[model samples]
Target chain A: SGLVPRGSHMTPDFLAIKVGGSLFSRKDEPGSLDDDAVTRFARNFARLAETYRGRMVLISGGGAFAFSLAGLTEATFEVKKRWAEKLRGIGVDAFPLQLAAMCTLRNGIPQLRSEVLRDVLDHGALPVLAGDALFDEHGKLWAFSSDRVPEVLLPMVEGRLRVVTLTDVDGIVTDGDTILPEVDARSPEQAYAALWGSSEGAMHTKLDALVTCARRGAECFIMRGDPGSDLEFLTAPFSSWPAHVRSTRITT
Target chain B: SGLVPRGSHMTPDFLAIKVGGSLFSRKDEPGSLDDDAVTRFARNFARLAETYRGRMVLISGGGAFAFSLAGLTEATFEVKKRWAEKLRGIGVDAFPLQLAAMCTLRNGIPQLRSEVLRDVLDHGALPVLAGDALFDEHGKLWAFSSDRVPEVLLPMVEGRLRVVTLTDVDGIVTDGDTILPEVDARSPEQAYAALWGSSEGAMHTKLDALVTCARRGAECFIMRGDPGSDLEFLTAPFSSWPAHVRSTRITT
Candidate 1:
């Protein structure tokens, strides 16, 4: 029953970063890899990790490497492994963990062994997890999304937790080009409505997860992460973000 | 205890292959990586995995990538992950697992979660394990060797189990040039003496593990695998090995 995390041990904050699959691959050209974008992201992410004195975890999505349900899970695993290596190449201590190996579904809900995440962090390494293809207790294979990583980490950390999701889109929008700056605890209806109007199917799932995190006392950020963009928001508070970078912050 | 492996599974046999770090790096040249050797081994190993109707696990050692104990474990993990990816690139379904994550040392002995190895095979993929840096119950970090992989896998397979170690040497030698053909159940004193006299320190540890596996009814082979060599014995019994491929078979 001693599951409470030692909040005062070392790091005072925990950061969970999710890299969208769309940022690494192109929809028009299936099975294409954006090497420059991945390298750029790894460089920036490693810098933030080095500068911030906090426990960190990275989640990856299936980009151009996925097609069907089975393919999606496999693609996500492959993507996460490659991402970990990329970060390692740039001097970041990242270790890859497969969700399929550590999780099983119960009534279509993911049941994850989250203690290992804390263990990896305690061992002084960044744990990289991805949306995986997992089997249920009855042997049915299911594709679990990376959007649920923060949900798994929320209760494990006693300090403040922040989740940053990097996608091709600027932020949750009401119209095609209208950016919604913030989705607070009081007004989530506008964000939900905007997500419903958006054609991106994946954002619907991600928005639901972000809303859940915000309600659970976690600050969430959905922002654009094109190649060579600034990563100042990763280590700073939302109020300190540069004026040029557009983002939607969901907070309590 | 329901630990008995099902003998009637689709795969009737089990294979565990260990690739020595010496084959991938040179002792004289520090931090040197032999790309051609790794690619060659991956190509041949993938073909064997595809043609054989049996379960397989691959373990890797730390060669040029390591120096101290900490470096050794990290190097081994990196080697195994890269090896798994190489096999995947050539169409072999291989997944990498960190022994540090899956194991803990108890009184200086490694206690591994062997069930996951079987689950991975049952899931129709190869599990790649490596020598790791692990923590004991006392929180002491220790370096574990890959030589112990077959020792862990021997009791998991019901039918037949074979372990092949690919090193730079032709086989276990008596002094410096005489190759030992076989070390069976009856006469093992000669093998032990030869190992005691050999210059290779790692082989001493490996032979100890192999001898233990042989006593437990698992067949073991230690042979040379230069840049290019025949891998016929990987799928065949010891009797069918090619004449040019000299190997030391440790068996019951």
Candidate 2:
């Protein structure tokens, strides 16, 4: 196989990270982006990539930038481009691949060209993607959630795959206060039923996406994305996760 | 007409700016982008835009980024995205619109959708574009020069238009030393014949673009783009140019 060898125990063949909007901007403020936090995360991520040396993709959640769908497509792209540039400024080869430019909605589902995405990865550049307002085949505007990008990307890697979602909260919580240490997909309903009641929109979709990733044998984690925190969880071995940080691991 | 009113003497209804690659990076060094210079330029440009208050489109020439056509399209886009983000970081609503994504080549000529570009301006976002490697109708790759963007954009504006090109030189020069204060379209050959004898690739095409703009009732200027210099020339009236800066004016 002409594939790059996957030998590192701590690093996966492909790593996908989704940085939530809450971590980069305030939800209450419309059309706001925290440039300082984005730069800090990019610096840390660049260091992590230097150590991991694996193919990676970055997804930026629609923070305060994408509240209104009226012009969400253009606004989301601006955020994603800004996020990617922060990484590139610190010497990371980040290529911004806009979802609207590359993908079209087919019956409300995103149809992405994996070959085009693969080409970016193959050229040794990190593809930065975000959910964007896209047009369907009929040319009608439709919104695609950024959370769904990882799902489309999972099947591209043949070996180990990992998806890390960094949000404002420490991790997935139960009873509105207690953070779950781990969630096994085999009996996921009991643990997440409480989450569904309180959070029907964003958190629910995130849980479903993470669950789908876990079922496909990709290791999934939800952790805090505050500026000062160490993101070793980004590439740490699964067994070493519990002792190093407060995070929730999802497993099939 | 629902268009924004055109009444300002200092500002044109639509302004197009092309920032040369030399000002942003070293041609001798491959893959080198001067972040400090870019930031300084962005800061100055932001202040200029704040005062101008006109619809603008920005084009970035591929400096150290697009030497090889192997991945020129991706590399060019990264530079354009980074440039746009720097503007946005300072509160300018800059949107990176990749030329390759929005345009396709037809018989080696670019075919851009003006409607989509118009939408960005209508929404009050500055559309950033660059020269990129695009595929033709036959699926063959073709290179579109950044200088050509102004030519395509000139016909789009129904009102007064201005195109400014910032390059490494003070202005279009003659006999290798003396700068031509202005190039009149009436007798262009005597002034530019010396230029074609030595420079045939980049400078020649730039002159052609500026000439075309001047012929179509648009004002054009070529000036220095080094950081730390005042860019008041960006929005200054034509009569006020000679006292403040040493730049070339392209006129009909």
Candidate 3:
């Protein structure tokens, strides 16, 4: 039998958002950041924060710029850590977002804290959590991805935490014409194989993240963002994607 | 000096504010951070950014936390790189000033850019310059101090630049009751020998930073934050501190 309801986990009141890094750069050149993309994302998110004040977690990734920056070092941790920090730089590169936001780091790894999250929100600020190069328990630099943020954050969250992977597409599409409503370990990895790299590799990372969130008793989903798009889900986890789902909910 | 001017290098419109890391922690614990102090600093900064509406370069240090994180790794580039990246983790750890600010990295070393620095300020956002572990022009992990940000930034800036070291004191004081209104290297480093630790080491770093700014044609000053008192100096560089002074300028 499932052990007694695991530790008084209440309904979640916060959301962890991971925005890809590819969006920050133009051709992936060193320091070649696209101000338009950065500004657009930041302003849009700020509005979203206003609508969902005091209830959020934000993470930006190191996309194309990160990949191009790899030649700078041979140390795995060094490379990974740089990628993470680069992602932060990409986020910071969008400096206009600071009017209503803030950032955090863990062991120099850009991260989030439950307390600051609430504090910043209450103070009318949006917190920018980055997908950073982090140190694992082993004390080595692990070039970590922003998608894996759920693991680091899930345990620290107070209420039921909801996660969403913000991407360019409508959501997960299955086969040629159908968008599978959801996915899981049971979602037949092959069905998603065609989806990976097809949707800019975001699908794989999102799916992986969704799975991790579900396992840790947090709600999760895959969503698309467009101008004037409804942002209800950005703040509240998709009600249907329970913390213990065997599959991830898709929103194509 | 040449009889003619090389170019029209007027004064700077931007300000580089290096807020020491020691301000973020208590008792100088290695990697040990005082969350309350961090929140206060971040919140204070967010307000400062708002009052100025963009016109600042934010920099953070390792403080008590950095020295501790140092011993965790060996004395190699990896060690230095982690230290730099860790500094980032330290910034991201703040979590409340992102609305108009962002951070960067060079390898594990945290850094900034010219275009964005000016761009963010113009857009009414602050570009957070990380005093991260950095690499020199030659590929080496140089654990740069937040105080050293001006060295790299001065060259990148066009027009004139102003700098202010935001610490916990009012100004450079010589005797307990007497704040020396001004000083140069001619003051003998000894007059400040008592001033450095007496000022709780902030003056030491601030002077170092002031020297860097002065050498680069930027006017610099050493000042303190008396909570809610006033943030006017943050945007306007100290007007009296002359540039090209081989010695530092200290004001009471």
Candidate 4:
């Protein structure tokens, strides 16, 4: 009874900025974050940030961006201090989400910033923030897989959460050659069995995080993220897509 | 036609963080940010910030705070930026309103953030922002002064604008020691001449800003801002005070 039409004025735009393995490896692979890739990505993302403006909530994946910075790789209290210091040195004032909370006010954006799942919902704003960890008083960092973040955020968005996992493959296939039309409501075990070992590395971590999020009452889909189609997939309404679009759907 | 009666919920407990001349004095006056003043000031300001949460907009006089930081002198752009940066460093991120604009915003109490202002107006949220120089791309720094700020903001408020400027006098008193009973229309020049070179140094700046605001169509009044009477005076209806208080009245 509560489902509203998409693209309404009050309907907020949910954006996830995944910064994991695939993003860093783009150099060796074609269409990675090379000169053209960075430009295209920046232009598209900037447009999205501007279009959504105050309404855009960014969920950053913990891969290259997180790991490239010091102390973010490990989940510890000391690490958080180092991470904050490092970010500040680079001119990014990395304060607790509350400090980020002030950013929304200054920038004219109404934002609720949190690294925890529950707090994001309680503090209502156009862009609701959820990231890895529960930042405690002692200044600690917690590491949650990027895949699991959407799971927590999606339910708050009311079961209409779009999952965009950018990997090497265009879509999931059953027999390496045959693309599966859809797996609307499959057990995590079943989905894992289909995508596991298909590619050499990183896919398993993605699958694990995806399954965890799906189990927690989230609708998820994995699609080809290269060429920036993942962002497009996120904006498109689910009802419009045909049954067979080379995607894996996990609904609970 | 648009003015709404002040609702029960609308009456927020007013807290004044007087950046008193003692606090702003560069000679390290005996009372400047001393144990008593700092404690009293911090407690009051913090209470206000916490009580209003996002609802409060601070209106501080340019006394010791401004003078000690930039000297009791002319308002220059660089001087303003330095002061602004100092305030931001202390975690106050609000846009600074020029003296006139401060008075106007305090009177109007409009939503300070544009996004929140739009949403509140759209959704009928009570306790909107009232301040000047709303953050925009064109002017990133100080955008509006308190003097003329009210005129620009009054129309944007959902209902009637209530303005009250607190001064150190007993009330508005004329030069000849006679208080004018009622002033419907008055000119800035008359108000300036009446209060100029008075015992209170605050009058010159306050009148200068208020006159500029009055010329721009702001319904204003200058009353005693002394400790016990300020809040009572602000709460009193517009009809209670004399039109010219202590000043000469000039009709249109």
Q: Residue B83 deviation, candidate 3, in Å?
A: 11
Off by over 4 Å in 3: A1-12, A28-30, A63-124, A185-202, A227-252, B1-252
TM-score of 3: 0.41
What are the TM-scores, per candidate, against the unseen true structure? Answer: 0.67, 0.55, 0.41, 0.36
Q: TM-score of model 2 relative to the true fold? A: 0.55
Q: 3 or 4: which has the higher lDDT?
A: 3
lDDT of 1 by residue, B15-131 (tens): 888988888877787666688888998887887777653388878765423113434444565676577767777777676665665666677766664244456577677777787
lDDT of every predicted structure (CA atoms)? 0.70, 0.70, 0.46, 0.36
Model 3 chain B: ten consecutive residues of lowest lDDT: B92-101
Error of 1 at B61 (Å): 5.4
TM-score of chain B of each: 0.85, 0.86, 0.58, 0.44
DockQ (C-alpha) of model 3?
0.09
lDDT of 2 at A5: 36
RMSD of each: 6.6, 10.7, 18.5, 14.4
| Winner on DockQ (1 vs 3) | 1
Q: Judge candidate 2 against the unseen true structure and give its global Cα lDDT, from 0 to 1.
A: 0.70
Give the winner by TM-score: 1
